[PDB]
Symmetry: D2
Subunit: 306 residues, 4 copies
């Protein structure tokens, strides 16, 4: 079985991404990073999630409580005040581990050398800081699956997607490190990570433990997505990314390009792609261009059905 | 008949755009700006074009020989050394007018108040500088049709399109002046402004004065486009824009959005679009999202067969 | 007698600079630009000053009501709401000319070719725009004296001085056009263009038409300076610049350097100087490094007394 | 005795600063960071230095071999290709420690809680990365003495000083962390850290083991300073900073201000100081404005004359 770490800013769809990761892979741990909502709450949400889903022995490690330069805002309008659509859930009794996420990533990369894969469904701060501490980590990590970036439809600024915007320095460091990277950008999630009202009716009538979990945590994500898309639905970028890592045929089309990240001015966080290979930098990532949404929906439905 | 000025950095497709404008509209003048190739050469290309096509009475006005900040390069690799695919064409008799483009635009905006339309198929320098000279011009201009910008597929930098990149300051000034603007971006021209090998075979067989002009002036544009697209053909952004101006049904989909232009850093020239309307500036341009390439092709074919 | 135009964002010390210029030089005109206070108020201040000081036949030309990119704010906290320390002065009957400042600058550059000097005591918008309209103006202007920039002690941002901050694009354009340029920076004004409490004691006892004008127009500038310097007095950058132009021996030390202006990020407006000549752009301006404050004070007191 | 770590990009004057530190303080360790010359050569220089000056037991820890963003260049023209003015010095026995500088800084911050001072005479990368790993380190570090920044006379770009230019991100991080910081900027070193021809004559005549080391290691620094300053001499910013830390009376004037670092554009690495307290961030550093060069020269001479 393939071995993963999920690096998460735990709220809403990140929780479903962990759920899915715990079924498809040997989940060696969940590392926490600043992003979506208050960090302590993110940590609470991850521990509760792993407990609820019967994976109490997956360790949670605390990582950076800020991006490298400390410039971001939380998005409670998308995820709820608690990152769980204000579902007042029962306090978990699971606790985090002592080891820092940076130390854990570096350790797990030695123990599982050549096999470790990272599902990076958050700002890239922990991975960038691990790499700066020990650059030989690139020898040992098999693959990184990154949710982030946008071609043009920034969801946070006009141009920038949330993860890259929170920590563009981290994104830049990770992209030029020399990892094997596939990137799942926002536009691909918007189309292929989408659920419509009938998909919601169907999940809602499942009345399983995991289906009620899904409805409960993602209520605010659906409200927000419905507002911005102008049709009832929700968008699930981290679940899609985890599904693609597992089943690579969910990728219908992709390209190997040189991907850069703007650090400055109004365009801070922008994903800059040398589409025409005119600028003499070597390709550093596979960018997903089209994905199979039906196939994601069925993996998701199946996991909530169990 | 509708009344237009064409503002052009005259090379390759610009000349066909001028041809089309002169058939579809009352062409009140061609204003010349820095961009594609050496300025004095652009002037010659426009004077030659206007004589060759039987429009020798249309005046040519010299505008700015640099963008506002003077930061650009010419792109002889696309247009040829002379902006006409190295066709050594005969020197025309026609000379430019003495009146500066800026003074001509403002003067014509009063003579033709409420009717003057601008076909902006070049860096926006002359339009910006006329506005800074007399901001009341906004009240007298009916419409500006702009070829510029990219969503993601920058043709000059990884993110920036040529016209926007050459004079980003000018583009920002024009976009925020208060004109009624429609923008035709690079991705739309790449799809719906394109001609394939069978189209080129047809055009060469027409064997008219105009069809031979088209083949001669555009050879290098075909070579350049063929290399960068990986399939034989040529892309005609300025001709497509003029065609859209003429027949608005060529617009299949568009959206009124707030468009901003990055002035700084690696992303200078980038077209920033508030797609989800999250950022509190009201929309300022109709962005064309999909065009009818077949309808454009027929307009071009008709024009060249005269 | 040397021939000058004063380009002014007319508030407080600008009016004293206009006074001195009219006594020291043949004052061919005053051009108005956006900057210190509301533009229409600046015009009224310039009209009033010229009438009050017996120079009613010096023409006032309206230039740009915004800097090139339109990004600034007025500083009523320094100059009073009306740019005259809230002196509700009587309406003058002098009117401005019809001719735009850009057109007047270019015309006067031809009528006074090789002699015309510009006293640039404001953001540099009008001069930059005249240059972009007709770059041959650099063959016709004898000299530009610029009040602008700071080494480190930004008076508007941490690093940027007001004039350069308001229109950094214009500053960059003017510095690279090829004029003969001397710059009086903020730190030199702060030291050598300052008046102390004993100086104000003296001026307020003179009881002349001009001394009463000085006291009335500069009251708020003294309040502001005293708050920001921690000791009673005022700073007179424009009057010092006009005085240096007149009597060059007031320059005690200066250097010919390559000077650049930052357009981007937190440092927007910063004056960048290649002090060690390490960067391969040839020098473009004389930077004043030390001035004779005593000689300035004596010139001011003499003028105010006569 | 006061206890210090020296954080150094070891070449030329860093070696003398290490020497001074070893005499004035309990020197707990030298940490190495990328900057001045090739990183592996810097490690060799620190090892040789400590061995040669009789401090074999001072541990050397390898830190980051790049700034956070990996954007810099070495300056072999100032320090020589080996960072020791091409002195082919004999290879020492001493080898570095295994522990990473980041870990050692954090460890020594606990071991010497409330007493540890850092002599930060290089780009600030190791300190920033230690802080991001464990933000509580601020509670435990007593003081940081930073050599870095320029008011206007950038020695690397027109505005930026080398250390701040190499890692502006790290500088920003360190400045806002909440440490007790005194900064010694370039202009202060240039005046008060300077040695003239007579000082060099005196030092060569000392003919001690230490005086020969100084003359040998700093030859290229003298050659570079002499061409760029136009007077025979050398500049010793790191040795001045260590001297100031030791004898605080060497500070003749200083100011408590809010200090910022530019990360973008032509001004990247610029030190931005809120001189007038206009911008509502609380002060974060003591900035040295004038130093006692006479006192500095005697500490140096005493160090060399033994
Ligand atoms: Ca996430
Ligand atoms: Ca064009
Ligand atoms: Ca002024
Ligand atoms: Ca150093």
């Amino acid at each position: 079985m393939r071995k993963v770490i999920v690096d998460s800013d735990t709220a809403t769809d990140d929780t479903i991404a962990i759920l899915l990761a715990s079924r498809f892979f040997q989940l060696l741990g969940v590392t926490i990073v600043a992003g979506n909502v208050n960090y302590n709450q993110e940590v609470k949400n991850a521990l509760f999630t792993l407990e609820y889903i019967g994976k109490q022995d997956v360790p949670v490690y605390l990582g950076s409580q800020r991006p490298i330069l400390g410039n971001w805002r939380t998005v409670e309008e998308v995820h709820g005040s608690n990152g769980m659509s204000n579902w007042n859930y029962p306090e978990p009794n699971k606790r985090p581990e002592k080891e820092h996420a940076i130390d854990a990533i570096l350790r797990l990369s030695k123990e599982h050398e050549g096999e470790l894969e990272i599902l990076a469904i958050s700002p890239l701060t922990n991975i960038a800081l691990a790499y700066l501490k020990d650059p030989s980590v690139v020898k040992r990590v098999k693959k990184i699956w990154i949710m982030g970036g946008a071609f043009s439809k920034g969801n946070t600024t006009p141009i920038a997607e949330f993860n890259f915007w929170v920590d563009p320095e981290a994104a830049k460091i990770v992209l030029d490190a020399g990892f094997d990277i596939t990137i799942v950008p926002w536009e691909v999630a918007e189309i292929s990570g989408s659920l419509n009202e009938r998909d919601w009716e169907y999940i809602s009538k499942l009345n399983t433990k995991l289906s009620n979990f899904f409805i409960n945590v993602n209520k605010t994500l659906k409200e927000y997505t419905t507002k911005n898309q102008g049709i009832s639905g929700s968008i699930h970028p981290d679940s899609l990314t985890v599904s693609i890592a597992h089943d690579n045929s969910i990728i219908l089309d992709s390209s190997l390009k040189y991907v850069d990240v703007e650090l400055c001015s109004k365009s801070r966080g922008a994903m800059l792609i040398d589409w025409y290979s005119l600028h003499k930098n070597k390709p550093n990532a596979e960018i997903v261009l089209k994905a199979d949404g039906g196939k994601f929906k069925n993996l998701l439905f199946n996991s909530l059905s169990q």
